[PDB]
Structures are given as structure tokens and as C-alpha cells.
């Protein structure tokens, strides 16, 4: 057994219940992304307070703005920060753990120079 998992006196099960803290699957249809484009985000808002914000959320949630009018309306700042990169480039297909390859040559290689099989580390 391992500590602190085996402790008799300080581990409630619900503090280490990782199965029940599973990540929810996030689904985004085009209405949600429309809302993200127009109203901004929880992180960086572009919404007014009071009835204005709730009514804006409602009328995007009903169909008033389409995704394409959403994109055309979008300013340069929005398009560069929040659709493309800050330089205007598209984001690359992301990688969880990037792997930098190196080629081992010489004596530390597996086969000698002639063979058509190289050693990558």
C-alpha cells in the first residue's frame, strides 16, 4: 500500500474519488460558437450588463444571428486573437507531448554505416 492512500485517519474517499471527478465531454454546435464570437467569453467578455446581456444571449440562442454573419461582423481583433493566432496564422494540429527526434551515428548506432537502417533517439 502507499501513503497517504493507506492512512487510517486523514483520507475521506470523496477527496480521492477520481472516477466521479471525470471530465465532461464538451459539445459545441454553431450557435454556441456564434455566441462566443459575438458576446465574447467568460475569460474576456464583450457583453453588456442587465437585460441587454440576457437578451443578447437569448437572441443568439434563438437564431437571430447566423454563424456566417457572426464571422463577417467579427473585427480584425477578434479574428486574429480568437480564430487565428495573434499573427494571423492558423493554429497547427496540436500535440500533447512534442517529440524531438535525434539521429545517432557512428559507434553508438545499432548497425554500421552500410546497412539501410538508422538509429533514431
Amino acid at each position: 500500500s502507499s501513503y497517504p492512500t493507506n492512512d487510517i485517519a486523514e483520507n475521506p474517499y470523496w477527496k480521492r474519488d477520481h472516477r466521479r471527478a471525470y471530465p465532461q465531454t464538451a459539445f459545441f454546435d454553431q450557435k454556441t460558437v456564434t455566441g462566443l464570437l459575438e458576446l465574447g467569453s467568460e475569460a474576456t467578455p464583450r457583453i453588456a450588463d442587465g437585460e441587454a446581456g440576457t437578451k443578447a444571449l437569448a437572441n443568439i440562442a434563438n437564431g437571430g444571428v447566423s454563424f456566417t454573419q457572426a464571422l463577417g461582423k467579427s473585427s480584425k481583433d477578434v479574428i486574429y486573437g480568437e480564430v487565428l493566432t495573434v499573427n494571423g496564422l492558423p493554429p497547427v494540429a496540436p500535440t500533447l507531448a512534442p517529440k524531438q527526434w535525434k539521429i545517432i551515428e557512428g559507434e553508438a548506432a545499432i548497425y554500421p554505416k552500410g546497412y539501410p537502417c538508422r538509429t533514431f533517439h
Binding site: 492512512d7 487510517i8 485517519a9 486523514e10
Partner: protein, 455 residues
């Protein structure tokens, strides 16, 4: 400075049986003198006076007496036809405490008068005084006094010609500490086992026989007529703010001279001990601890009682309580672990068994304390024992569970190193112990556990 009680300011004058309990002697004390006029005055006036008094519950919880009495008078109370009940709690039972026994034995007419006056204040049709069954002779004395009061028209149809009807009866308990709990008390009055009810409903709404009722301690009721006569401001003059008046302070344990007496609230503990009881046996150097109030409250270490006042506020601030003001001192010759083990045994014996956290946790607490008494346990188990008390506290139907959890917590907090020493003594002495008190030679044989002490 607080605590000098002067004999003229004393409430319970027959405490030492120096004047008699006969109705004539109580008359000499002045009891039943203005009772006509006190009844004729409005219930609103009695309630407002009791509020101005600063009196708070004496059974151990210290709720404001006036407000608790007021709850039995909602605006449309008369529309709910039927009897209204006052219940008087004389179940004592809290180990350490003897005050109500003295009140029943020495000044019964004061209790009878208090029942009348409170019943008026609560518009009650009848009273029932619930008495613990071991107080047989106390029950005889209280009955005799009640017969006297009935005879003289003090207590009956026209209470001193008031036009206010009151009947007063004695119901006897039969051996259950839990019946001191107000709802368990009501259930026992109704002819059931003393298992408490959940709240709501509260007794003022639905209580004894489903009627509006109110359950009160005998000392809060017995002082009430004196309070009404002498005025609320006077009673407020004794003790600090919100802890005002004078309480009986039974003192027991390892003092030179055990005693029972009345004193101002907010009195220092050192002064109380030295001046009433002859002091701790061996001197203030020889004091391990004090339990202020009965067994249900967490024990006080040596260095806090040197500065602590016998209030609710002061005791709560140092994480204990007044309870029933039953002081128990423990000197350096005794084992605190054994005393707490005995308290755990008491709570295991007094659980009514209704609700799982108490019904099982008290038994587990007793097993753990039996092992801690001899040292047959691992040190981390102390923390586990602490967590065990938190299983029971706050999770039960009634407050017996919290009472059972508290003394253990006081013990751990104040005397952990004592337990650690006993554990070292066992480990050196007997052997190495696993959790639960098992050891390497211990196993099950032909029905029993052999190879281990088995506390």
C-alpha cells in the same frame, strides 16, 4: 469582581435544611404571599419580567427562559382548543449533578409555585413534573408538598381564587438518562419508550399528547416566583451581561470538602473551589483538570481554570460549557483516561438506540477507550478516534450523541501525551500492537480470540 452571594440575596434558603420544608416554613420564607396578585397580572407582564430577568435555561443549554416560554403563545393560540401542558424536567441523570434533588427535597413549595406561575405565563391548563425513579423519597416529599398546596387552594380550580385552573401531577421515570431530553421526556410521559422525536415539530406547536407543551428545568421554574417578586433588574444585577443571576453549583470529585451551594454567575473557578470546598486535595499544584458542568462537556486543563469565570460565555470561549454547573475536579493521582473511559461506558449504556450514528458509535467509542486505557493501540489511532467522534457529532436525532462525542475530544485535545505514554508503556511492557489491538500471536481458536489481552 463576581461572586460574593449574600444570604439576603440567596434564593434557595432551605438548601441546608436549616428552616424546614413545611408549608408554614415556606410561608415564613414568603412563598405564596402575593400569588393572587401575580396571577391577576397579565401573562404578558410575567413573560416580559422573565425576559428582563436575564434568566436562561438551567437544564444545560441556557436558552432564554422568557423567549422559550413566549413561544407557547402565538397570536391565535386560543383558537386551538384543548389542554395546554407545562412539563417540569426533574430527571437529573447528568452524572456530576445533584441540584434538582436538593430543590425537590428542601424547597418543594417553591417548585409548586413556579409551576403555577409559569403555567399562567404559558396559559397552561395542567402541569406534569417528570421525576427520575431513583428519587423515590424526593418524590414522596414533593407529593406531600403538592397535597398541602392542593388543600390550601393554592393549586386547583380557583388558584387562590384567581379564576385560573391548574392541576399539578407527578410522573415518575424508571431508569433512563435519555428521558432528560425534552422530546424523549414527552414520549415517555405518553406511555412509549423514551426515544426522542425529530424537530420540527417543536413542543410549543405539537407536544405532550399532541398539544402545545413546554419542557423546562426545575431550577429555572423554581427561581421564577422569587424573580417575579424581587424584580427583573435585581436578578440582572448579579453576574455579567447575558449571564445574570445566581446558580446552584454542585461540586464533586477530588476536592477536600464536596458541597452544594448557590453563587453568582461569572465567579472565578479558583475562588469557587478555595472558598466553598476547601480546595483541591493536595493544592492547586496537584490539579490535573476540571470538568465544569456534568460529564457531557469537555474537560478544562490546569492553567485555564486559574482564569475562567463560571458563565456560559466564558466556558464556551475556552471550548467547554456550563452545562448543569456540576463541577468535577480530577487531581494528579487519578487517571484521566480511566475517567473518560467511564464516561464513554455511561454514554454507551444510556443510548436509546434509535439512530445509527449514536447506537453504533457509542459502542465503538467504548471499545476504543478500553484499548486506550491499557495502551493496546497505535498512536495514529488517536487521530482515528478523533475522527470517530465526528461521525456522531451533528448527525444524530438528539444531543446525546454530541454529549457522547465531546468528552473524548476534550481528552484528546488536553491529554494526548498521556495517551502516548500509556501506549509506550504497553509496547515496551506487553508487545507490539496492530490497529484494533491485535498482536502477532493473536488469532481465532475454537470460538474465541486467544493470544491477546482482549480489553
Amino acid at each position: 469582581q463576581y461572586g460574593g452571594l449574600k444570604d439576603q440575596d440567596r434564593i434557595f434558603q432551605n438548601l441546608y435544611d436549616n428552616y424546614g420544608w413545611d408549608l408554614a416554613s415556606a410561608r415564613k420564607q414568603g412563598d405564596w404571599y402575593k400569588t393572587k396578585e401575580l396571577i391577576l397580572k397579565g401573562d404578558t407582564w410575567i413573560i416580559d419580567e422573565i425576559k428582563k430577568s436575564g434568566l436562561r435555561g438551567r437544564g444545560g443549554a441556557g436558552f432564554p427562559s422568557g423567549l422559550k416560554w413566549s413561544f407557547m403563545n402565538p397570536p391565535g393560540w386560543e383558537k386551538n382548543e384543548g389542554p395546554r401542558y407545562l412539563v417540569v424536567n426533574a430527571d437529573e441523570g447528568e452524572p456530576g449533578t445533584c441540584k434538582d434533588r436538593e430543590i425537590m427535597r428542601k424547597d418543594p413549595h417553591k417548585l409548586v409555585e413556579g409551576c403555577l406561575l409559569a403555567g399562567r405565563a404559558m396559559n397552561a391548563t395542567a402541569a406534569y413534573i417528570y421525576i427520575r425513579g431513583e428519587f423515590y423519597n424526593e418524590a414522596a416529599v414533593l407529593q406531600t408538598a403538592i397535597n398541602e398546596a392542593y388543600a390550601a387552594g393554592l393549586i386547583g380550580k380557583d388558584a387562590c381564587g384567581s379564576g385560573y385552573d391548574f392541576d399539578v401531577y407527578i410522573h415518575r421515570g424508571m431508569g433512563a438518562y435519555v428521558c432528560g431530553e425534552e422530546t424523549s421526556l414527552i414520549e415517555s410521559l405518553e406511555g412509549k419508550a423514551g426515544k426522542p422525536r425529530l424537530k420540527p415539530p417543536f413542543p410549543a406547536g405539537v407536544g405532550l399528547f399532541g398539544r402545545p407543551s413546554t419542557v423546562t428545568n426545575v431550577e429555572t421554574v423554581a427561581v421564577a416566583p422569587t424573580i417575579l417578586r424581587r424584580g427583573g433588574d435585581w436578578f440582572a444585577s448579579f453576574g455579567r451581561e447575558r449571564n445574570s443571576g445566581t446558580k446552584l453549583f454542585c461540586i464533586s470529585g477530588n476536592v477536600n470538602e464536596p458541597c452544594t451551594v448557590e453563587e453568582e454567575m461569572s465567579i472565578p473557578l479558583r475562588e469557587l473551589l478555595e472558598k466553598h470546598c476547601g480546595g483541591i486535595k493536595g493544592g492547586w499544584d496537584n490539579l490535573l483538570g476540571v470538568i465544569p458542568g456534568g460529564c457531557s462537556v469537555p474537560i478544562l486543563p490546569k492553567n485555564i481554570c486559574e482564569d475562567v469565570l463560571m458563565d456560559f460565555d466564558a466556558l464556551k470561549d475556552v471550548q467547554s460549557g456550563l452545562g448543569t454547573a456540576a463541577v468535577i475536579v480530577i487531581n494528579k493521582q487519578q487517571d484521566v483516561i480511566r475517567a473518560i473511559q467511564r464516561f464513554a461506558a455511561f454514554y454507551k449504556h444510556e443510548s436509546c438506540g434509535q439512530c445509527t450514528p449514536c447506537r453504533e458509535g457509542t459502542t465503538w467509542l467504548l471499545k476504543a477507550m478500553d484499548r486506550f486505557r491499557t495502551g493496546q493501540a497505535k498512536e495514529r489511532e488517536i487521530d482515528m478516534l478523533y475522527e470517530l467522534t465526528k461521525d456522531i457529532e451533528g448527525h444524530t436525532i438528539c444531543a446525546l450523541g454530541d454529549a457522547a462525542a465531546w468528552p473524548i475530544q476534550g481528552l484528546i485535545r488536553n491529554f494526548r501525551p498521556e495517551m502516548e505514554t500509556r501506549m509506550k508503556k504497553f509496547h515496551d511492557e506487553v508487545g507490539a500492537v496492530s490497529v484494533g489491538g491485535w498482536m502477532k500471536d493473536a488469532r481465532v481458536e475454537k470460538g474465541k480470540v486467544v493470544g491477546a489481552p482482549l480489553p
